[PDB]
Design a protein around this ligand. Structure first.
Ligand SMILES: */C=C\C1=C(C)C(=O)N/C1=C\C1=NC(=C\c2[nH]c(/C=C3/NC(=O)C(C=C)=C3C)c(C)c2CCC(=O)O)/C(CCC(=O)O)=C1C
Length: 477
Protein backbone atom coordinates (compact mmCIF):
# COMPACT_ATOMS: atom_id res chain seq x y z
CA UNK A 1 0.00 0.00 0.00
CA UNK A 2 0.79 3.79 -0.49
CA UNK A 3 4.09 3.26 -2.48
CA UNK A 4 3.33 -0.37 -3.48
CA UNK A 5 -0.14 0.73 -4.75
CA UNK A 6 1.63 2.93 -7.39
CA UNK A 7 2.32 -0.40 -9.22
CA UNK A 8 -1.01 -2.31 -8.41
CA UNK A 9 -2.29 -4.93 -10.99
CA UNK A 10 -5.65 -3.15 -11.31
CA UNK A 11 -6.34 -4.86 -14.73
CA UNK A 12 -6.43 -8.33 -13.09
CA UNK A 13 -8.33 -8.03 -9.71
CA UNK A 14 -10.37 -11.22 -10.29
CA UNK A 15 -13.33 -9.12 -9.09
CA UNK A 16 -15.99 -7.14 -10.84
CA UNK A 17 -18.63 -4.57 -9.81
CA UNK A 18 -21.84 -6.49 -8.91
CA UNK A 19 -24.14 -4.38 -11.12
CA UNK A 20 -22.95 -6.78 -13.88
CA UNK A 21 -21.92 -10.27 -14.93
CA UNK A 22 -18.83 -11.53 -16.66
CA UNK A 23 -18.24 -14.94 -18.26
CA UNK A 24 -14.99 -16.21 -19.69
CA UNK A 25 -15.64 -18.49 -22.69
CA UNK A 26 -13.43 -21.02 -24.56
CA UNK A 27 -13.60 -20.11 -28.31
CA UNK A 28 -13.21 -23.82 -29.32
CA UNK A 29 -16.05 -25.64 -27.42
CA UNK A 30 -17.88 -22.48 -26.31
CA UNK A 31 -17.87 -23.48 -22.61
CA UNK A 32 -17.95 -20.94 -19.67
CA UNK A 33 -14.57 -21.58 -18.03
CA UNK A 34 -14.89 -18.74 -15.40
CA UNK A 35 -17.77 -16.47 -14.25
CA UNK A 36 -18.66 -13.75 -11.73
CA UNK A 37 -20.58 -14.67 -8.54
CA UNK A 38 -23.30 -12.52 -10.14
CA UNK A 39 -23.71 -14.91 -13.13
CA UNK A 40 -25.71 -17.47 -11.03
CA UNK A 41 -28.72 -15.29 -10.01
CA UNK A 42 -28.99 -13.72 -13.50
CA UNK A 43 -28.62 -16.82 -15.74
CA UNK A 44 -30.67 -18.80 -13.15
CA UNK A 45 -28.37 -21.82 -13.01
CA UNK A 46 -26.05 -22.49 -9.97
CA UNK A 47 -22.44 -21.23 -10.27
CA UNK A 48 -21.05 -24.79 -10.24
CA UNK A 49 -23.47 -26.00 -12.93
CA UNK A 50 -22.78 -22.81 -14.91
CA UNK A 51 -19.00 -23.54 -15.08
CA UNK A 52 -18.33 -25.74 -18.16
CA UNK A 53 -21.76 -25.06 -19.67
CA UNK A 54 -21.87 -24.05 -23.42
CA UNK A 55 -22.90 -20.32 -23.34
CA UNK A 56 -25.58 -21.21 -25.99
CA UNK A 57 -27.52 -23.25 -23.30
CA UNK A 58 -27.58 -20.30 -20.83
CA UNK A 59 -27.95 -17.02 -22.86
CA UNK A 60 -29.83 -16.23 -26.12
CA UNK A 61 -28.01 -13.57 -28.23
CA UNK A 62 -30.51 -12.07 -30.72
CA UNK A 63 -28.44 -9.24 -32.30
CA UNK A 64 -24.61 -9.86 -32.42
CA UNK A 65 -23.02 -13.32 -32.09
CA UNK A 66 -19.32 -13.90 -31.05
CA UNK A 67 -16.67 -15.24 -33.47
CA UNK A 68 -13.11 -16.62 -33.51
CA UNK A 69 -10.54 -13.81 -33.88
CA UNK A 70 -7.02 -14.43 -35.39
CA UNK A 71 -4.75 -11.53 -34.32
CA UNK A 72 -5.97 -8.21 -32.86
CA UNK A 73 -9.10 -8.37 -30.59
CA UNK A 74 -12.57 -7.26 -31.72
CA UNK A 75 -14.89 -5.59 -29.17
CA UNK A 76 -18.62 -5.92 -29.94
CA UNK A 77 -20.98 -3.19 -28.70
CA UNK A 78 -23.61 -3.84 -25.92
CA UNK A 79 -26.56 -5.71 -27.53
CA UNK A 80 -29.78 -7.55 -26.39
CA UNK A 81 -29.27 -10.72 -24.23
CA UNK A 82 -31.96 -13.03 -22.81
CA UNK A 83 -31.66 -15.95 -20.29
CA UNK A 84 -33.40 -19.22 -21.40
CA UNK A 85 -33.13 -21.09 -18.04
CA UNK A 86 -34.44 -18.62 -15.39
CA UNK A 87 -38.14 -19.28 -14.41
CA UNK A 88 -39.19 -15.61 -13.87
CA UNK A 89 -37.41 -13.00 -16.12
CA UNK A 90 -35.25 -10.26 -14.48
CA UNK A 91 -36.63 -6.87 -13.39
CA UNK A 92 -34.78 -4.93 -16.15
CA UNK A 93 -33.64 -5.94 -19.66
CA UNK A 94 -30.01 -6.86 -20.05
CA UNK A 95 -27.44 -5.89 -22.68
CA UNK A 96 -24.12 -7.71 -23.62
CA UNK A 97 -20.70 -6.68 -24.97
CA UNK A 98 -18.19 -9.26 -26.24
CA UNK A 99 -14.36 -8.96 -25.92
CA UNK A 100 -12.96 -11.41 -28.51
CA UNK A 101 -9.38 -12.52 -27.98
CA UNK A 102 -7.56 -15.45 -29.73
CA UNK A 103 -7.33 -17.57 -26.51
CA UNK A 104 -10.54 -16.22 -24.79
CA UNK A 105 -13.95 -14.68 -25.35
CA UNK A 106 -14.99 -12.36 -22.52
CA UNK A 107 -18.71 -11.52 -22.39
CA UNK A 108 -19.68 -8.64 -20.08
CA UNK A 109 -23.32 -7.87 -19.44
CA UNK A 110 -25.27 -5.23 -17.42
CA UNK A 111 -28.86 -3.81 -17.33
CA UNK A 112 -29.84 -1.88 -20.47
CA UNK A 113 -31.09 0.89 -18.01
CA UNK A 114 -32.16 1.74 -14.37
CA UNK A 115 -35.94 1.74 -15.52
CA UNK A 116 -34.79 5.17 -16.82
CA UNK A 117 -34.91 7.04 -20.18
CA UNK A 118 -31.74 7.53 -22.22
CA UNK A 119 -30.23 10.82 -23.26
CA UNK A 120 -30.06 11.13 -27.01
CA UNK A 121 -27.37 12.52 -29.33
CA UNK A 122 -30.28 14.68 -30.56
CA UNK A 123 -30.28 16.13 -26.96
CA UNK A 124 -26.45 16.32 -26.72
CA UNK A 125 -26.28 18.08 -30.12
CA UNK A 126 -26.67 21.74 -28.97
CA UNK A 127 -23.74 21.00 -26.56
CA UNK A 128 -21.50 19.33 -29.18
CA UNK A 129 -22.25 22.04 -31.87
CA UNK A 130 -21.34 24.69 -29.24
CA UNK A 131 -18.21 23.04 -27.62
CA UNK A 132 -16.71 23.05 -31.19
CA UNK A 133 -17.33 26.82 -31.81
CA UNK A 134 -15.80 28.00 -28.47
CA UNK A 135 -12.59 30.16 -28.57
CA UNK A 136 -9.92 28.82 -26.20
CA UNK A 137 -9.59 25.46 -24.35
CA UNK A 138 -10.76 27.05 -21.04
CA UNK A 139 -14.11 28.48 -22.35
CA UNK A 140 -15.00 25.07 -23.96
CA UNK A 141 -13.88 23.08 -20.88
CA UNK A 142 -16.35 25.01 -18.66
CA UNK A 143 -19.19 24.56 -21.33
CA UNK A 144 -18.56 20.77 -21.19
CA UNK A 145 -18.61 20.76 -17.30
CA UNK A 146 -21.99 22.56 -17.18
CA UNK A 147 -23.59 20.88 -20.24
CA UNK A 148 -22.73 17.35 -19.04
CA UNK A 149 -24.00 17.99 -15.50
CA UNK A 150 -27.34 19.15 -17.03
CA UNK A 151 -27.46 16.36 -19.74
CA UNK A 152 -26.34 13.36 -17.64
CA UNK A 153 -27.60 14.44 -14.20
CA UNK A 154 -24.54 14.54 -11.91
CA UNK A 155 -23.68 16.41 -8.68
CA UNK A 156 -20.20 17.45 -9.86
CA UNK A 157 -18.46 17.47 -13.27
CA UNK A 158 -14.72 18.29 -13.31
CA UNK A 159 -12.33 18.77 -16.31
CA UNK A 160 -8.65 17.91 -15.69
CA UNK A 161 -5.56 18.82 -17.78
CA UNK A 162 -2.49 16.58 -17.26
CA UNK A 163 0.98 18.22 -17.30
CA UNK A 164 4.32 17.04 -18.83
CA UNK A 165 5.11 14.83 -15.76
CA UNK A 166 1.41 13.60 -15.51
CA UNK A 167 0.36 15.94 -12.61
CA UNK A 168 -3.31 16.99 -12.76
CA UNK A 169 -4.96 20.42 -12.59
CA UNK A 170 -8.78 20.87 -12.27
CA UNK A 171 -9.29 23.52 -15.00
CA UNK A 172 -13.12 23.39 -15.06
CA UNK A 173 -15.80 22.43 -12.53
CA UNK A 174 -19.63 22.59 -12.49
CA UNK A 175 -21.34 21.58 -9.26
CA UNK A 176 -24.31 22.00 -6.87
CA UNK A 177 -24.08 25.39 -5.04
CA UNK A 178 -24.62 23.47 -1.73
CA UNK A 179 -21.42 21.51 -2.67
CA UNK A 180 -17.87 22.90 -2.26
CA UNK A 181 -15.35 23.83 -5.04
CA UNK A 182 -12.17 22.04 -6.20
CA UNK A 183 -11.59 24.46 -9.13
CA UNK A 184 -7.91 25.34 -9.29
CA UNK A 185 -6.72 22.31 -7.29
CA UNK A 186 -3.54 20.54 -8.49
CA UNK A 187 -2.84 16.86 -7.52
CA UNK A 188 0.40 14.82 -8.15
CA UNK A 189 0.83 12.12 -10.80
CA UNK A 190 1.02 9.31 -8.12
CA UNK A 191 -2.71 10.04 -7.40
CA UNK A 192 -3.56 8.38 -10.79
CA UNK A 193 -1.00 5.47 -11.35
CA UNK A 194 0.45 4.72 -14.82
CA UNK A 195 -1.94 1.71 -15.29
CA UNK A 196 -4.96 3.73 -14.11
CA UNK A 197 -4.26 6.32 -16.87
CA UNK A 198 -3.52 3.54 -19.40
CA UNK A 199 -6.90 1.83 -18.73
CA UNK A 200 -8.62 5.30 -18.92
CA UNK A 201 -7.21 5.75 -22.44
CA UNK A 202 -7.98 2.09 -23.39
CA UNK A 203 -11.67 1.94 -22.11
CA UNK A 204 -12.90 5.27 -23.34
CA UNK A 205 -15.25 5.79 -20.35
CA UNK A 206 -14.77 4.25 -16.86
CA UNK A 207 -17.57 3.97 -14.30
CA UNK A 208 -17.89 3.20 -10.56
CA UNK A 209 -21.64 2.63 -10.08
CA UNK A 210 -21.50 2.45 -6.26
CA UNK A 211 -18.43 3.12 -4.10
CA UNK A 212 -18.74 0.52 -1.40
CA UNK A 213 -20.19 -2.23 -3.62
CA UNK A 214 -19.52 -5.73 -2.35
CA UNK A 215 -17.16 -7.08 -5.08
CA UNK A 216 -18.27 -10.06 -7.17
CA UNK A 217 -15.31 -12.55 -7.47
CA UNK A 218 -14.54 -14.32 -10.76
CA UNK A 219 -14.70 -18.07 -10.14
CA UNK A 220 -12.32 -19.77 -10.61
CA UNK A 221 -9.95 -16.77 -10.17
CA UNK A 222 -7.59 -18.20 -12.90
CA UNK A 223 -8.37 -20.13 -16.15
CA UNK A 224 -8.73 -23.92 -15.49
CA UNK A 225 -6.74 -24.85 -18.71
CA UNK A 226 -4.54 -21.69 -19.04
CA UNK A 227 -3.99 -20.92 -15.29
CA UNK A 228 -4.02 -17.14 -15.77
CA UNK A 229 -6.05 -14.30 -14.10
CA UNK A 230 -8.70 -12.53 -16.13
CA UNK A 231 -7.45 -9.46 -18.01
CA UNK A 232 -10.33 -7.07 -17.17
CA UNK A 233 -8.30 -4.43 -19.12
CA UNK A 234 -11.23 -4.04 -21.56
CA UNK A 235 -14.01 -4.99 -19.08
CA UNK A 236 -15.97 -1.95 -17.83
CA UNK A 237 -17.27 -4.04 -14.86
CA UNK A 238 -13.63 -4.29 -13.62
CA UNK A 239 -13.55 -3.72 -9.82
CA UNK A 240 -11.78 -0.58 -8.47
CA UNK A 241 -8.64 -0.34 -6.26
CA UNK A 242 -9.35 -0.35 -2.48
CA UNK A 243 -7.16 2.78 -2.48
CA UNK A 244 -9.42 4.83 -4.85
CA UNK A 245 -12.55 3.55 -2.97
CA UNK A 246 -10.82 4.70 0.28
CA UNK A 247 -10.19 8.10 -1.34
CA UNK A 248 -13.77 8.63 -2.77
CA UNK A 249 -15.48 7.31 0.47
CA UNK A 250 -13.63 10.11 2.39
CA UNK A 251 -15.25 12.70 0.07
CA UNK A 252 -18.63 10.88 0.29
CA UNK A 253 -18.73 10.47 -3.51
CA UNK A 254 -20.69 7.24 -4.16
CA UNK A 255 -20.47 7.01 -7.99
CA UNK A 256 -18.05 8.31 -10.65
CA UNK A 257 -17.89 8.53 -14.46
CA UNK A 258 -14.50 9.31 -16.02
CA UNK A 259 -14.21 9.97 -19.73
CA UNK A 260 -10.94 10.45 -21.66
CA UNK A 261 -9.81 13.64 -23.28
CA UNK A 262 -7.73 11.95 -25.99
CA UNK A 263 -5.83 14.38 -28.27
CA UNK A 264 -3.24 13.13 -30.86
CA UNK A 265 -3.73 9.60 -29.43
CA UNK A 266 -2.45 10.91 -26.01
CA UNK A 267 -4.29 11.26 -22.71
CA UNK A 268 -4.56 15.05 -22.57
CA UNK A 269 -6.75 15.17 -19.42
CA UNK A 270 -10.03 13.71 -18.09
CA UNK A 271 -13.76 14.50 -17.93
CA UNK A 272 -14.68 13.35 -14.44
CA UNK A 273 -18.21 13.13 -13.05
CA UNK A 274 -18.87 12.67 -9.26
CA UNK A 275 -22.20 11.73 -7.69
CA UNK A 276 -22.85 11.59 -3.95
CA UNK A 277 -25.75 9.14 -4.51
CA UNK A 278 -25.19 5.74 -6.26
CA UNK A 279 -25.52 6.08 -10.03
CA UNK A 280 -25.23 3.34 -12.70
CA UNK A 281 -24.39 4.92 -16.07
CA UNK A 282 -25.83 2.69 -18.76
CA UNK A 283 -24.22 2.12 -22.16
CA UNK A 284 -26.26 4.81 -23.92
CA UNK A 285 -25.14 7.58 -21.44
CA UNK A 286 -21.57 6.29 -21.59
CA UNK A 287 -21.53 6.60 -25.39
CA UNK A 288 -23.06 10.10 -25.22
CA UNK A 289 -20.40 10.98 -22.63
CA UNK A 290 -17.70 9.67 -24.98
CA UNK A 291 -19.29 11.71 -27.83
CA UNK A 292 -18.89 14.74 -25.52
CA UNK A 293 -15.30 13.82 -24.42
CA UNK A 294 -14.30 13.42 -28.12
CA UNK A 295 -15.93 16.80 -29.19
CA UNK A 296 -14.11 18.67 -26.38
CA UNK A 297 -10.83 16.77 -27.16
CA UNK A 298 -11.46 17.55 -30.83
CA UNK A 299 -11.69 21.29 -30.18
CA UNK A 300 -8.75 21.56 -27.73
CA UNK A 301 -6.59 19.79 -30.38
CA UNK A 302 -7.88 22.17 -33.11
CA UNK A 303 -6.86 25.14 -30.86
CA UNK A 304 -3.53 23.39 -30.09
CA UNK A 305 -2.84 23.17 -33.87
CA UNK A 306 -3.71 26.87 -34.23
CA UNK A 307 -1.25 27.76 -31.42
CA UNK A 308 1.50 25.47 -32.95
CA UNK A 309 1.08 27.14 -36.38
CA UNK A 310 1.51 30.54 -34.63
CA UNK A 311 4.67 29.29 -32.77
CA UNK A 312 6.22 28.13 -36.08
CA UNK A 313 5.27 31.54 -37.70
CA UNK A 314 6.74 33.66 -34.84
CA UNK A 315 9.92 31.54 -35.29
CA UNK A 316 9.66 32.04 -39.09
CA UNK A 317 9.66 35.85 -38.55
CA UNK A 318 12.58 35.74 -35.98
CA UNK A 319 14.90 33.80 -38.40
CA UNK A 320 13.98 35.99 -41.46
CA UNK A 321 14.54 39.16 -39.32
CA UNK A 322 17.97 37.88 -38.06
CA UNK A 323 18.96 37.86 -41.81
CA UNK A 324 18.84 41.72 -41.52
CA UNK A 325 21.73 42.56 -32.97
CA UNK A 326 20.77 42.42 -29.17
CA UNK A 327 18.16 45.27 -29.53
CA UNK A 328 17.19 43.74 -32.94
CA UNK A 329 16.31 40.73 -30.71
CA UNK A 330 14.98 42.92 -27.79
CA UNK A 331 12.26 44.44 -30.04
CA UNK A 332 11.01 40.91 -30.84
CA UNK A 333 11.28 39.98 -27.06
CA UNK A 334 7.45 39.55 -26.40
CA UNK A 335 7.45 37.30 -29.50
CA UNK A 336 10.57 35.48 -28.09
CA UNK A 337 8.30 34.53 -25.12
CA UNK A 338 6.00 32.68 -27.62
CA UNK A 339 8.47 30.64 -29.84
CA UNK A 340 9.64 29.12 -26.52
CA UNK A 341 6.82 30.25 -24.24
CA UNK A 342 8.04 31.56 -20.81
CA UNK A 343 6.90 33.98 -18.05
CA UNK A 344 9.79 36.36 -18.83
CA UNK A 345 12.83 37.09 -21.03
CA UNK A 346 16.06 38.89 -19.91
CA UNK A 347 18.58 39.79 -22.62
CA UNK A 348 22.15 40.57 -21.34
CA UNK A 349 24.53 42.96 -23.12
CA UNK A 350 27.48 42.82 -20.69
CA UNK A 351 26.02 44.22 -17.45
CA UNK A 352 23.00 46.02 -18.97
CA UNK A 353 19.92 43.76 -18.59
CA UNK A 354 16.47 44.25 -20.15
CA UNK A 355 13.53 42.32 -18.56
CA UNK A 356 10.26 42.18 -20.67
CA UNK A 357 7.84 39.69 -19.01
CA UNK A 358 7.62 38.33 -15.44
CA UNK A 359 11.33 38.24 -14.51
CA UNK A 360 13.18 38.74 -11.16
CA UNK A 361 14.56 42.34 -10.71
CA UNK A 362 17.85 43.11 -12.54
CA UNK A 363 20.27 42.35 -9.65
CA UNK A 364 18.88 38.77 -9.44
CA UNK A 365 19.37 37.96 -13.18
CA UNK A 366 23.02 39.15 -12.97
CA UNK A 367 23.64 36.64 -10.11
CA UNK A 368 22.26 33.77 -12.34
CA UNK A 369 24.40 34.95 -15.36
CA UNK A 370 27.67 34.86 -13.27
CA UNK A 371 26.96 31.32 -11.93
CA UNK A 372 26.67 29.82 -15.48
CA UNK A 373 24.49 23.41 -26.78
CA UNK A 374 22.68 25.76 -24.33
CA UNK A 375 22.17 25.06 -20.56
CA UNK A 376 18.65 24.72 -19.10
CA UNK A 377 17.18 23.89 -15.61
CA UNK A 378 13.76 22.88 -14.10
CA UNK A 379 14.87 23.69 -10.53
CA UNK A 380 17.12 26.75 -10.15
CA UNK A 381 18.59 25.28 -6.89
CA UNK A 382 19.25 21.61 -7.84
CA UNK A 383 22.20 22.67 -10.04
CA UNK A 384 23.33 25.40 -7.51
CA UNK A 385 21.37 26.27 -4.27
CA UNK A 386 23.06 29.76 -4.05
CA UNK A 387 20.25 30.87 -6.46
CA UNK A 388 17.52 28.96 -4.56
CA UNK A 389 16.21 32.20 -2.89
CA UNK A 390 14.91 33.38 -6.32
CA UNK A 391 13.03 30.15 -7.32
CA UNK A 392 9.78 32.27 -7.65
CA UNK A 393 9.83 34.46 -10.87
CA UNK A 394 12.74 32.26 -12.22
CA UNK A 395 12.80 28.53 -11.17
CA UNK A 396 13.42 27.30 -14.72
CA UNK A 397 15.69 28.93 -17.30
CA UNK A 398 17.30 28.44 -20.78
CA UNK A 399 20.67 30.28 -20.86
CA UNK A 400 21.84 30.52 -24.46
CA UNK A 401 25.15 32.45 -24.80
CA UNK A 402 25.48 34.06 -28.25
CA UNK A 403 29.32 34.36 -28.41
CA UNK A 404 32.42 34.83 -26.11
CA UNK A 405 33.32 38.11 -28.02
CA UNK A 406 30.25 40.11 -26.84
CA UNK A 407 28.96 39.61 -23.27
CA UNK A 408 25.54 39.29 -25.00
CA UNK A 409 23.30 36.37 -23.93
CA UNK A 410 19.70 35.30 -23.47
CA UNK A 411 17.86 33.94 -20.43
CA UNK A 412 14.24 32.70 -20.59
CA UNK A 413 12.43 32.31 -17.25
CA UNK A 414 9.33 30.61 -15.81
CA UNK A 415 7.87 31.41 -12.32
CA UNK A 416 7.52 28.89 -9.42
CA UNK A 417 4.62 26.54 -10.18
CA UNK A 418 2.89 27.53 -6.85
CA UNK A 419 2.75 31.19 -8.13
CA UNK A 420 0.57 30.34 -11.18
CA UNK A 421 -2.43 29.03 -9.12
CA UNK A 422 -5.82 30.48 -10.17
CA UNK A 423 -6.80 31.50 -6.55
CA UNK A 424 -8.95 34.38 -7.95
CA UNK A 425 -11.33 31.96 -9.79
CA UNK A 426 -12.04 29.93 -6.60
CA UNK A 427 -11.16 31.65 -3.27
CA UNK A 428 -12.27 28.42 -1.40
CA UNK A 429 -8.93 26.76 -2.42
CA UNK A 430 -6.71 28.42 0.23
CA UNK A 431 -9.24 28.14 3.11
CA UNK A 432 -10.00 24.47 2.01
CA UNK A 433 -9.76 21.82 4.77
CA UNK A 434 -8.62 18.18 5.18
CA UNK A 435 -10.99 15.23 5.68
CA UNK A 436 -11.18 14.57 9.48
CA UNK A 437 -9.59 11.08 9.96
CA UNK A 438 -8.14 10.20 6.54
CA UNK A 439 -4.88 9.11 4.89
CA UNK A 440 -6.12 10.34 1.47
CA UNK A 441 -8.00 13.58 0.59
CA UNK A 442 -8.23 16.37 -2.01
CA UNK A 443 -6.82 18.91 0.51
CA UNK A 444 -4.10 16.41 1.44
CA UNK A 445 -3.43 15.85 -2.34
CA UNK A 446 -2.86 19.60 -3.09
CA UNK A 447 -0.08 19.72 -0.44
CA UNK A 448 1.56 16.47 -1.74
CA UNK A 449 1.70 18.09 -5.23
CA UNK A 450 2.98 21.42 -3.73
CA UNK A 451 5.85 19.40 -2.12
CA UNK A 452 6.86 17.49 -5.33
CA UNK A 453 6.70 20.79 -7.32
CA UNK A 454 8.11 23.36 -4.69
CA UNK A 455 11.09 25.14 -6.27
CA UNK A 456 10.20 23.53 -9.61
CA UNK A 457 9.29 25.57 -12.72
CA UNK A 458 6.25 24.83 -14.92
CA UNK A 459 8.21 21.78 -16.31
CA UNK A 460 8.54 23.00 -19.95
CA UNK A 461 11.62 21.53 -21.89
CA UNK A 462 9.72 19.99 -24.97
CA UNK A 463 10.18 21.03 -28.67
CA UNK A 464 10.92 24.54 -27.25
CA UNK A 465 14.41 23.36 -26.06
CA UNK A 466 16.05 22.69 -29.51
CA UNK A 467 13.95 25.51 -31.13
CA UNK A 468 15.59 27.85 -28.57
CA UNK A 469 19.05 26.21 -29.05
CA UNK A 470 18.68 26.61 -32.91
CA UNK A 471 19.17 30.39 -32.41
CA UNK A 472 22.68 29.71 -30.95
CA UNK A 473 23.47 27.67 -34.11
CA UNK A 474 21.85 30.59 -36.08
CA UNK A 475 24.37 33.05 -34.50
CA UNK A 476 26.92 31.85 -37.21
CA UNK A 477 26.02 34.80 -39.54
C1 LIG B 1 -1.35 4.37 -4.99
C2 LIG B 1 -1.92 5.18 -5.86
C3 LIG B 1 -3.12 6.07 -5.50
C4 LIG B 1 -3.15 7.10 -4.53
C5 LIG B 1 -1.98 7.50 -3.63
C6 LIG B 1 -4.48 7.79 -4.53
O1 LIG B 1 -4.82 8.70 -3.85
N1 LIG B 1 -5.34 7.07 -5.58
C7 LIG B 1 -4.44 5.98 -6.19
C8 LIG B 1 -4.76 5.10 -7.11
C9 LIG B 1 -5.85 5.37 -8.13
N2 LIG B 1 -6.47 6.69 -8.37
C10 LIG B 1 -7.47 6.54 -9.48
C11 LIG B 1 -8.24 7.48 -9.99
C12 LIG B 1 -8.19 8.94 -9.53
N3 LIG B 1 -7.68 9.38 -8.36
C13 LIG B 1 -7.84 10.72 -8.29
C14 LIG B 1 -7.35 11.53 -7.07
C15 LIG B 1 -7.73 12.74 -6.70
N4 LIG B 1 -6.73 13.81 -6.27
C16 LIG B 1 -7.55 15.05 -5.88
O2 LIG B 1 -7.13 16.07 -5.50
C17 LIG B 1 -8.97 14.69 -6.03
C18 LIG B 1 -10.11 15.64 -5.67
C19 LIG B 1 -9.90 16.85 -5.22
C20 LIG B 1 -9.09 13.34 -6.49
C21 LIG B 1 -10.43 12.65 -6.71
C22 LIG B 1 -8.47 11.14 -9.45
C23 LIG B 1 -8.85 12.57 -9.80
C24 LIG B 1 -8.68 10.04 -10.21
C25 LIG B 1 -9.40 9.98 -11.57
C26 LIG B 1 -10.83 9.47 -11.32
C27 LIG B 1 -11.78 10.52 -10.76
O3 LIG B 1 -11.74 11.69 -11.21
O4 LIG B 1 -12.65 10.25 -9.88
C28 LIG B 1 -7.43 5.05 -9.87
C29 LIG B 1 -8.30 4.40 -10.93
C30 LIG B 1 -9.62 4.13 -10.24
C31 LIG B 1 -10.31 2.94 -10.88
O5 LIG B 1 -11.32 3.14 -11.62
O6 LIG B 1 -9.86 1.78 -10.63
C32 LIG B 1 -6.41 4.36 -9.06
C33 LIG B 1 -6.03 2.88 -9.14
Amino acid sequence: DLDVCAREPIHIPGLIQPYGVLLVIDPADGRIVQASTTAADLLGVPMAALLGMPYTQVLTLPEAQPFAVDDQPQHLMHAEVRFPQRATPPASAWVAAWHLYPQQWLVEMEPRDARLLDVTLREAMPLLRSVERDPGIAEAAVRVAKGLRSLIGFDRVMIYRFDEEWNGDIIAEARKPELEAYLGLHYPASDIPAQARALYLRNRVRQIADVGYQPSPIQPTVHPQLGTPVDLSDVSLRSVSPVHLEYLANMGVTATLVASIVVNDALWGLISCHHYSPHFTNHAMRDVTDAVARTLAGRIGALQAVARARLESVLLTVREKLITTVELLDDMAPDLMDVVDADGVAIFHGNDISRHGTTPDVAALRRIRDHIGALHVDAIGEVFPELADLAPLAAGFIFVPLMPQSRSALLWTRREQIQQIKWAGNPQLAKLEDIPNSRLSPRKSFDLWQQTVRGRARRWSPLHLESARSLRVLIEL
